[PDB]
Amino acid sequence: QSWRKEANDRILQHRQRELVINVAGIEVEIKQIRHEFAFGSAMNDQVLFNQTYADFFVQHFNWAVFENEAKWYANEPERGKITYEKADAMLNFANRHQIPVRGHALFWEVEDANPNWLKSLPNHEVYEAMKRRLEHAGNHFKGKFRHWDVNNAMMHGSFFKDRFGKQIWKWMYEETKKIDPQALLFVNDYNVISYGEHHAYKAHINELRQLGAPVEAIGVQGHFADRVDPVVVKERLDVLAELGLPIWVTAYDSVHPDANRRADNLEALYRVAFSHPAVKGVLMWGFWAGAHWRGEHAAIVNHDWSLNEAGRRYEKLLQEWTTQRVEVTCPAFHGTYEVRKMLQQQTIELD
Ligand SMILES: [Ca+2]
Ligand SMILES: [Ca+2]
Structure with a gap:
């Protein structure tokens, strides 16, 4: 609904910095190799x-x-x-x-x-x-x-x-x-x-x-039961954000037999956290059904190593949040880019 709309403005505001500087204007390739945000x-x-x-x-x-x-x-x-x-x-x-x-x-x-x-x-x-x-x-x-x-x-x-x-x-x-x-x-x-x-x-x-x-x-730590409300999470993160210290979602998981509910749980948290400017990284506490401390109803990839719906959502989320472009003005995500020389662009300045 409307939280995703807000979350995305936040994402492009705080997770991106404009590019082409020196240390032009016609035909270049802008590929991202490393990601400054933690998807761990x-x-x-x-x-x-x-x-x-x-x-x-x-x-x-x-x-x-x-x-x-x-x-x-x-x-x-x-x-x-x-x-x-x-x-x-x-x-x-x-x-x-x-x-x-x-x-x-x-x-x-x-x-x-x-x-x-x-x-x-x-x-x-x-x-x-x-x-x-x-x-x-x-x-x-x-x-x-x-x-x-x-x-x-x-x-x-x-x-x-x-x-x-x-x-x-x-x-x-x-x-x-x-x-x-x-x-x-x-x-x-x-x-x-x-x-x-x-x-x-x-x-x-x-x-x-x-x-x-x-x-x-x-x-x-971000251990959920069966539902992840993106707005309740966002409000809660705001309360901690008052301290001026960085927030990290250290051990995310939720458990639901329906891989669709999971996939939606993972997107609620990941998109909201990525949107939140005090959050600096999100780590999932396990991924494989054969070795997840919350069992197979917490996995993004199945026993047989085929993605389930939460796995493909996760993968789709990460592609959405990757700057591959050929075009000299670009909103690129914080990270390392290959331009066709390798080149960094950190969170330091708003450019
Ligand atoms: Ca928690
Ligand atoms: Ca050990």
Whole structure:
């Protein structure tokens, strides 16, 4: 209806910059090779043994994140026994295909998400584990992740807050800033654009910055049930946008047996977020029916690697949002272009 009309004006205003400058007027080719906006997805173990999953990933996503392989339990399954070999293998795969990778995650506030050995230790020995995690993992992945989900779901857990108070949150963002300062420190949480916890969230981010925590970017996870209302999402994003920090839809999915409802769910979120000027990237939390943590009713591509309707919608969406043109005045999307020399055009200036 009318939200799509508004969303598209917003898209062409904020996602495009006019072209042909110098560092003419007749016969040129304007092809886009890289996209500044993030159309990412979560990667899992399949990328290590499944060539089709990998090939698909590389032809559908320009940003990655690890579904488990950089969570604390997976990096320290037993206290003192430390491993990063899977996560490193994936960091190499990503770097081979120049895919920027979100780092996920240093800490998780809900008890259900942390190593079981941590759950029986006294507080001081808990913090000792926290200290090596932050310092061992922060140093190992220094310069390897564009972002960190420093702590996740503080609004819905209390494992660390209950033993050290909100001052331990400040600790996590300060110490991570110290070890890897080029990394964008994220808050990440759920039920904020899917459910209506955006006012609570915005207050939470405020509270974090006001106690000195350097949080620099807001992650909204974007886990929906069976419907995605584009206007309720847009209003909710506006509430968070008041903080002047970038918004990222970090882990999108919805679940509906009807692939058509999904396809429409994916378009409501993706188009609205892309339209919203505070949003800077959208990552889907999985794609394949054979390896989606919400099961096959969350997939865009089928068990047998044939697209379903959400997959083709996603693909159609990305073609819509790509500047291929032969024509010397062009509204081109932010990214890298090939002109027939390779050439960038970033978000920096409004031209
Ligand atoms: Ca793993
Ligand atoms: Ca959410």
